């Protein structure tokens, strides 16, 4: 399948990521949501890869951690 190419302008592939549900819908004009039905949508940028994946750089979150433990064993006494 032949394929040509001509002057390509600057393109900014973006998307709207909901909150209450956190769902993304292909639309940069819509004001409402479908997943849940929120009345507010936040604009977020997205990168494209040869393969075709979406990456959204988010702000690290506070993920605390708990202390670890250890295991032991035992055996006979005599005989
Ligand atoms: Zn929603």
Give the 3-state DSSP-derived string for 21-49, with helices as H, strands as E and coil as C: CCCEECCCCCCCCCCCCCCCCEEEECECC
Neighbours of ion ligand 1 (CB under 5 A): 18, 21, 33, 35-36, 38
Domains of the chain: 1-79 (6.20.210.10)
Residue with tokens 């690290």: 60
Cα 55 from Cα 1, distance rounded (Å): 29
**C-alpha distance from residue 15 to each of 8, 25, 28, 45 (Å):** 21, 7, 6, 6
Nearest C-alpha neighbor of 14 from the set 51, 52, 42: 42
Distance between Cα 66 and ligand 1 center (Å): 33
């Amino acid at each position: 399948g032949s394929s040509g190419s001509s002057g390509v302008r600057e393109a900014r592939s973006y998307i709207l990521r909901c909150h209450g549900c956190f769902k993304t819908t292909s639309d940069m004009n819509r004001v409402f949501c479908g997943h849940c039905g929120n009345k507010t949508l936040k604009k977020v940028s997205v990168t494209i890869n040869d393969d075709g994946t979406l990456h959204m750089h988010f702000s690290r979150n506070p993920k605390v951690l708990n202390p670890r433990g250890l295991r032991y064993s035992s055996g006979p006494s005599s005989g």
